Design a protein around this ligand. Structure first.
Ligand SMILES: [K+]
Ligand SMILES: [Mg+2]
Ligand SMILES: [Mg+2]
Ligand SMILES: [Mg+2]
Ligand SMILES: [Mg+2]
Ligand SMILES: [Mg+2]
Ligand SMILES: [Mg+2]
Ligand SMILES: [Mg+2]
Ligand SMILES: [Mg+2]
Ligand SMILES: [Mg+2]
Ligand SMILES: [Mg+2]
Ligand SMILES: [Mg+2]
Ligand SMILES: [Mg+2]
Ligand SMILES: [Mg+2]
Ligand SMILES: [Mg+2]
Ligand SMILES: [Mg+2]
Ligand SMILES: [Mg+2]
Ligand SMILES: [Mg+2]
Ligand SMILES: [Mg+2]
Ligand SMILES: [Mg+2]
Ligand SMILES: [Mg+2]
Ligand SMILES: [Mg+2]
Ligand SMILES: [Mg+2]
Ligand SMILES: [Mg+2]
Ligand SMILES: [Mg+2]
Ligand SMILES: [Mg+2]
Ligand SMILES: [Mg+2]
Ligand SMILES: [Mg+2]
Ligand SMILES: [Mg+2]
Ligand SMILES: [Mg+2]
Lengths: 72, 175
RNA sequence: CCAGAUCUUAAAGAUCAAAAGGAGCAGGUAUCAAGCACACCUAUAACGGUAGCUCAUAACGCCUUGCUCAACCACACCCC
RNA sequence: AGAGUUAAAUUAUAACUAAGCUGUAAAAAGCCCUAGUUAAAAUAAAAUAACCCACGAAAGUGACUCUAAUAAUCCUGACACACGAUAGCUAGGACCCAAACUGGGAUUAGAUACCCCACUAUGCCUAGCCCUAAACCCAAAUAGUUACAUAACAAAACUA
């Protein structure tokens, strides 16, 4: 019967939900690490825009927000 | 928005003769005072079409149906303002607007003269459907703001270049 | 569509065809979804004015690669 | 979706009597501030009707009353707009009762399980979020035909 496939998917999900719990703080470090590079790479993309347009400095009053930051 | 007067006979008990000779008691029992919201809508719909429509006896016309939907749309908005957490009526309000929006587009492509009069009288503002419906996330709206601001700054750099630098060359000519 | 080069001669015919342009057709990938000035008007060939242009029928990116064959496109040590 | 309301049960609580009361296949633990009877708020949940099959787009809804009310003159349509049981999160309020976790008892070689007792998150109301299900009638929407014709099984087969 099809139960031979639901059980196989049950064990994999049950083992994955223990791999996250055992190494929860390892994922916390990596997630924040990827978020910093995500923000930094976004800054370089905006920095490329104004440099190629001929300007020397970013337009006055423009401070790039940290979109990938925890807020509410 | 419209406000039907309170002391008015309901739609049905109007054309029958010999009403004004009746005492105030029966007139009170037939006025909008002792009638629920349903009878109020009839008076709103009856008055509204007689002010904007050309031929009131025609119900199958697109303009007549648009007037009918507008009465329901206004009624739903009044209900929504009171019961804010109601979700069944909020869905009805959105679908009623979409149906009126669809019918206004159909009227525009067939009879422009009538469409202009309907749009002006009812206060409806017809906006063309914007192409490429996309979800404006924070990254896109931020980068779009920068590009527009950089574009304005480039204009100032060139505009002052057109003024000062040309004048400096013209200074040699003028002396 | 074709300037220009060359040949012939009665200066108007022909051979090759740059640049520019488009009815249509044209590898893989959307886990590349937004590109960021990519539009236009006036007269000037300036200035001034409008705030637009391309894109889920695949723009903008990335990877692989000569070809649709009387032949065609490209390179001539490297820094297009 | 709002506003108002309560029949049956249960509990705080009081009186009276009794010495035991709960619990299991059998026991222990727990209680003795208890049990039975009479009187009785709040909170929560909605017997029989239902052998009925109605309403909504779906998830859902079946104690009573009132108000508001169920798009389109009646095709298809997304990554767009709106919604989405239960569990879970944030803040305040409620807490009869049920109850993950936890503690005790028993069983067992072990039982951090089934069984018994106690109690918490929580199930509840107001405001916000999360957007997941065997979200399954595993059968997409709109018009139709009973012709042709049985892989199997199931809820017969098919055309635009
Ligand atoms: K009941
Ligand atoms: Mg596996
Ligand atoms: Mg050419
Ligand atoms: Mg020529
Ligand atoms: Mg010539
Ligand atoms: Mg990948
Ligand atoms: Mg070279
Ligand atoms: Mg409510
Ligand atoms: Mg004992
Ligand atoms: Mg007692
Ligand atoms: Mg109490
Ligand atoms: Mg049923
Ligand atoms: Mg429907
Ligand atoms: Mg309906
Ligand atoms: Mg549709
Ligand atoms: Mg939910
Ligand atoms: Mg819940
Ligand atoms: Mg909850
Ligand atoms: Mg949290
Ligand atoms: Mg809480
Ligand atoms: Mg509790
Ligand atoms: Mg309890
Ligand atoms: Mg134990
Ligand atoms: Mg269901
Ligand atoms: Mg499914
Ligand atoms: Mg379905
Ligand atoms: Mg469909
Ligand atoms: Mg339908
Ligand atoms: Mg059908
Ligand atoms: Mg057989």
């Amino acid at each position: 019967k099809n139960i031979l496939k639901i059980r196989r998917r049950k064990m994999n999900h049950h083992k994955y939900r223990k791999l996250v719990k055992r190494t929860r703080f390892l994922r916390r470090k990596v997630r924040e690490g990827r978020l910093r590079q995500k923000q930094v790479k976004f800054e370089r993309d905006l920095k490329r825009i104004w440099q190629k347009a001929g300007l020397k400095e970013a337009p006055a009053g423009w401070q790039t927000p940290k979109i990938y930051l925890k807020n509410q | 928005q419209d406000d039907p007067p309170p002391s008015m006979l309901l739609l049905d008990y109007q054309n029958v003769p010999g009403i004004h000779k009746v005492d105030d008691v029966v007139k009170r029992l037939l006025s909008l005072e002792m009638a629920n919201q349903k009878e109020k809508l009839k008076i709103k719909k009856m008055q509204l079409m007689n002010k904007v429509l050309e031929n009131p006896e025609d119900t199958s016309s697109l303009e007549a149906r648009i007037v009918a939907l507008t009465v329901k749309i206004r009624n739903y908005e009044e209900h929504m303002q009171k019961h804010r957490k109601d979700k069944a009526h909020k869905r009805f309000l959105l679908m009623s607007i979409d149906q009126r929006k669809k019918m206004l587009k159909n009227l525009r492509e067939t009879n422009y003269a009538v469409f202009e009069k309907i749009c002006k009288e009812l206060g409806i503002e017809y906006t063309f459907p914007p192409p490429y419906h996309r979800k404006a996330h924070r990254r896109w709206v931020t980068k779009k703001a920068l590009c527009t601001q950089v574009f304005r700054e480039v204009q100032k750099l060139k505009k002052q270049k057109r003024a000062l630098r040309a004048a400096a060359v013209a200074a040699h000519k003028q002396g």
